[PDB]
Write a protein that binds this ligand. Sequence first.
Ligand SMILES: [Mg+2]
Ligand SMILES: [Mg+2]
Ligand SMILES: [Mg+2]
Ligand SMILES: [Mg+2]
Ligand SMILES: [Mg+2]
Ligand SMILES: [Mg+2]
Ligand SMILES: [Mg+2]
Ligand SMILES: [Mg+2]
Ligand SMILES: [Mg+2]
Ligand SMILES: [Mg+2]
Length: 234
Amino acid sequence: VKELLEAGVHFGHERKRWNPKFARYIYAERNGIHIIDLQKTMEELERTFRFIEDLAMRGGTILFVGTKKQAQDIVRMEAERAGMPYVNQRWLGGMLTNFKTISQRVHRLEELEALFASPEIEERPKKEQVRLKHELERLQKYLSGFRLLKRLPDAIFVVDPTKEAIAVREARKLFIPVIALADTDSDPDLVDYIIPGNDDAIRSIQLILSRAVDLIIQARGGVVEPSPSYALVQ
RNA sequence: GGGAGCCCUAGCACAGGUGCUGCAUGGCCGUCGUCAGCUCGUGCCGUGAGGUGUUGGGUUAAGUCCCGCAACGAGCGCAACCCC
Ligand SMILES: [Mg+2]
Ligand SMILES: [Mg+2]
Ligand SMILES: [Mg+2]
Ligand SMILES: [Mg+2]
Ligand SMILES: [Mg+2]
Ligand SMILES: [Mg+2]
Ligand SMILES: [Mg+2]
Ligand SMILES: [Mg+2]
Ligand SMILES: [Mg+2]
Ligand SMILES: [Mg+2]
């Protein structure tokens, strides 16, 4: 739960497709790439991790949203490590603003797996058997850890604001605090708690969600060890 | 001398009408068409009528199934359940 000269190589990123609104968090245009104000990344982190502490203490959940493939797997472990839910494959229209209706898909998954521990997987025609077993396929594929959500989450952790911007918009419309791993292509003001790092490159990404989940466990009550991911990021 | 009932005149209340209106109508039928379509709930977009979903790419006899996607689903159809 720290590291400051964990610039490592995960400080600055992105070329000139910036959101000029991200101007404060930049250090220079070192050869076609804005590099991120190192200090600010650490002090925004201060007020940020602070936020997340009180969330684990009060016993609420954080929905980890990362769809970007260069961060996809990482989300799965760190979100499984902590109890919290994750949206991993792709983000659906109304996971939040339509959160009731979307949860029928959860009502079915949990209940369709109950078909697969019964005598009725031998019963039922195979007209149903083929359809109703490759339907369970897809369900577990998108809601592999949305099903953990039983109500709207107290906050939400996105790894790319720009890319998962439908996720962001939904959060706001329901007044759900946005934590985000952001960099130069994003609108910082659209985000409540910003870690101005860089949405792409696993060396960042995982470092952040490691230390974040470290802190979540550390503050919930468990004080643990290295992660399932770590330097298993190639 | 009256009475129930049945056959009966003479008047009543009504019957009956394949007389009109199929644009006053129900019912049933023809037809586009056994064509693959027509909608809904909630969400999202839009001042609004409305839109998205139902568009895109592949496939099928088929909105048939697949991939994808601000949508996630569902109903009436298709298919199947019936017969030869
Ligand atoms: Mg990006
Ligand atoms: Mg008459
Ligand atoms: Mg008629
Ligand atoms: Mg047909
Ligand atoms: Mg015919
Ligand atoms: Mg307009
Ligand atoms: Mg409106
Ligand atoms: Mg259309
Ligand atoms: Mg198509
Ligand atoms: Mg169909």
